[PDB]
Structures are given as C-alpha cells and as structure tokens.
Design a protein around this ligand. Sequence first.
Ligand code: HEM
Ligand SMILES: O=C(CC1CCCCC1)N(CCO)C[C@@H](O)[C@@H](O)[C@@H](O)[C@@H](O)CO
Lengths: 126, 89
Amino acid sequence: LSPADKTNVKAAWGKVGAHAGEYGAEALERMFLSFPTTKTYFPHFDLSHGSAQVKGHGKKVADALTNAVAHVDMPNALRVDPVNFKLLSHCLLVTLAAHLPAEFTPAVHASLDKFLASVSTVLTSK
Amino acid sequence: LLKANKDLISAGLKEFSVLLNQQVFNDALVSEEDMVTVVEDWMNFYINYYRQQVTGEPQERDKALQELRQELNTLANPFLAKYRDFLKS
Ligand code: HEM
Ligand SMILES: O=C(CC1CCCCC1)N(CCO)C[C@@H](O)[C@@H](O)[C@@H](O)[C@@H](O)CO
C-alpha cells in the first residue's frame, strides 16, 4: 500500500478531474460489454447506453473515488454480488488508461490497480 | 533487434510481471473466463504504452511489439493456469 503508489494516485486522478462522472459511466459500460453476464444480475434497471441510472451511478462511483482519494481512512471514509465491484475497478482502470495514455506508465497503472483493488475490497469486504 | 527497444522490453516484461504478482487470488473473486479477459485487457494496455515509448523505424519497431506482445503472452499463460487451478481448489 506503498507511498509512491499514493503519489501516483493523487496525480492520476487530479489529471482526471472534471471527467470522473463521465468516466464512471464509461467504466460501467465496459463492464457490461467485456463481462456480458454482468447484466444478468440486473433486470430492474436501465442498462442501456446512456441510461440515466448508469449516468447517475457513474457520478456516484466517481465522487466516491475522489473522497477515497483525499482520505488515503477509506475504511473510515466508507446487497449486490462482490464481483461487480472487482470488475468495475478493472474497467475503471482501462477507462483511465484509455483517456490518459500519457499519464499511465506501467507503474502508475499498477499503482492504481492496487488502489482500486482495495477500494474494491473495503466495499465487498463489507 | 536494436538495444533501446530490446531494453524497453526487458523493462516491460518486469513491470508487467510485477503487476501479476500484486494480484491476490483471494481478495479478487472473479471467473476463469473473466480473468482471461482481464489479462487480455492488461497486455493491450502494455502494448499501447510501450508502443509510445518504442523507438525508430517500422521494420524494427512494430517488430519489437511482436516480441513484447509474445513475451507478455509467455508470462500470462502461467499466471492463468495458476488462477485456473486456484479457483478449482
Ligand atoms: C464505489 C461505487 C459505488 C457507490 C458509491 C455506490 C453507491 C450507491 C448508492 C449511494 C446507492 C443508493 C442510491 C440511490 O437511490 O440514490 C446505491 C444503490 C445501488 N447500487 Fe451502488 N454504488 C456503487 C457501485 C455499485 C456497483 C458497481 C453496482 C453494481 C453493478 C451497484 C449497484 C447498486 C444497486 C443495484 C443499487 C440499488 C438501489 C435501489 O434499489 O434503489 N452499485 N449505490
Ligand atoms: O440500480 C441502480 C443503478 C445501476 C445498477 C446496475 C449497474 C449499473 C447502475 N440504481 C437503483 C435506484 O433506482 C440507481 C441509482 O443509483 C440511480 O437511480 C440514481 O442515482 C439515478 O436514477 C438518478 O437518475
């Protein structure tokens, strides 16, 4: 849970800045595409492209992530099968790396993976 | 071959594998099918970054991302057999 890591995270996200929400949704979308079967657990929600629920839940996962960044006290910061959270994170990475191909060096990437794999855990360790 | 490149690969293969290692099979409850997709998403990222760093001529460059893409393969396959058999434990 390295300190170097900590520097990479703040940096990367700060670069994201004004696009957290957009990226939140985009991530969810990649999940539903790269992990089709993920949709299955959801038949009472709009999972269509541009759904408002997804746009809403993207903003949620973003804002959340931002906080979880300030307090890097995440389990002091803050049903649904766990795997969704594990996979969301994965896509979240992909999304970031695709929008910031410059900022994401094989290291910053790994440093984020770890970071998201924890936020992932503090959620489903719940 | 061309050194700059050759080295860039060594640097990669390591950084990649550092990532593989930072993966705790328990903490991340995922599927065989899914994991394959994930390592897939990972190497693509690597071939993307390193392609940005690779240097020079085409016959020499794109050729490099060949090895880079293979040596990554060669690393992932094992890591996959692990998780394969890990899930089945
Ligand atoms: C860090 C990310 C997340 C945060 C902060 C978060 C937050 C929330 C919040 C605050 C609610 C209450 C929402 C409301 O009606 O305003 C909620 C509900 C819900 N969330 Fe999440 N969520 C996250 C990730 C996810 C993921 C990855 C999934 C699954 C794909 C998911 C599935 C659901 C579902 C199914 C509900 C049901 C709400 C209802 O029945 O009205 N969430 N989430
Ligand atoms: O279920 C969701 C969102 C989706 C769950 C499946 C995976 C993608 C997201 N809900 C349930 C509440 O009705 C949505 C809330 O998070 C949103 O409804 C809310 O923010 C949104 O509708 C505002 O327009």
